[PDB]
Known about the structure:
Belongs to the apicomplexan parasites AMA1 family. This is Apical membrane antigen 1. By secondary structure, the protein is an alpha+beta fold. About 10% of the residues lie in helices and about 25% in strands. The strands form 6 sheets. It has a 6-stranded antiparallel β-sheet with strand order 13-12-17-15-16-14. It has a 5-stranded antiparallel β-sheet with strand order 3-11-8-9-5. The protein has a 3-stranded antiparallel β-sheet with strand order 18-19-20, with no helix packed on it.
Amino acid sequence: TPQNPFQTPELKAFLERYNVTLHHQSGVNVDLGQDKEVDGKLYREAAGLCPVWGKYIQLHQPNRPPYKNNFLEDIPTEAEYQKSGNPLPGGFNMNFVTPAGQRISPYPMELLEKSSKIKASTELGKCAEFAYKTTAMDKSNQATQYRYPFVYDSKRRLCYILSVSMQRMEGSKYCSTNDDPVNLTWYCFEPQKSPTANHNLIFGSAYVGKDPDAFLTKCPNQALKGYRFGHWTNGRCHDYTELADSWIEAVDSKAQCWVKTFTNDEVASDQPRTHSWNDWWPVHEKDQPHSGGDGRNYGFFYFDSNGKGKCALSHKAPDCLVSDSKAVSYTALGSLSEETPDIIIPSNDEALQCRSSEFPETFGSCDVQACKRQKTSCVGGQIQSTSVDCTAEEQNDC
């Protein structure tokens, strides 16, 4: 056989869902992939279709009252900012209230579970849906087409709608970090994922809630236990450790590799390398970057020849897999969890499965440049895709 066993229709859809370019279609680190007009001015907008697991915005407020360094805090009141001085106290969370004097964010899941205008079949999805219904009001109090990002906190079952859509601020000329410099309006912040903290948080653009059931099958929300991502060249599946432009960095735990997919310089991002107190959204500029999901988004935990924990990070959306029991594959979008987390299980994958009787063993031609060949088979109910030795005959072209 000459052909990618993963190029099957069922398998291609499977692999395709790892492709940030293909469904997400916006930055992951910073997501500002759309622009909407509000009150004459044009503003950047989180646009991405996939929820990102474990992402939060880290704050660099000064370590003293009234500062909390927690972006889930209400944005500051004029008075609260008067009483505090610079910089802004509070967080990114929308503190606006209903005409009926009810309060929009956070919002208890139980209420959403018992609202009939919310159709989404999932817990996470319901909250995404809630974000999508939440359009900005203009400066003559009308509905616009601008929508806020959302963070569902699963541990507390609260759905946060974020008034601030800014995801990154850098530079002493622009913001203070720990009140250095001193009289600056804005503290600094950045998107972050941790090996240990905030796995109960899920950052998404409201547009994740457009068709709030889609991301269940189109987004790479879990991690792949037992495979390395890889690309198909020369009739066999090269994992990332064989691709020249990949990054090989030592980690102590898989958790740390998972963070790196999100954290490396080159992860898909919409933030350019260079603000009033009241200004919650980024402005449009003529040349601002839209990654459109392009970037070093992909990697896997694995062990060296010498059993050194290492992490392979790549630009290349995987179009095949190398089976490896102790490896796990991560995207900049997905969680650390290898199993479907039960907040995206409706109360109301299969692609990787096989039987030997149906799926014969197969051998490709020698990839002479590496003197290995592809070997596909069915081992213990699941596709095995490895590289193995070429035959003696074949070896005489290496």
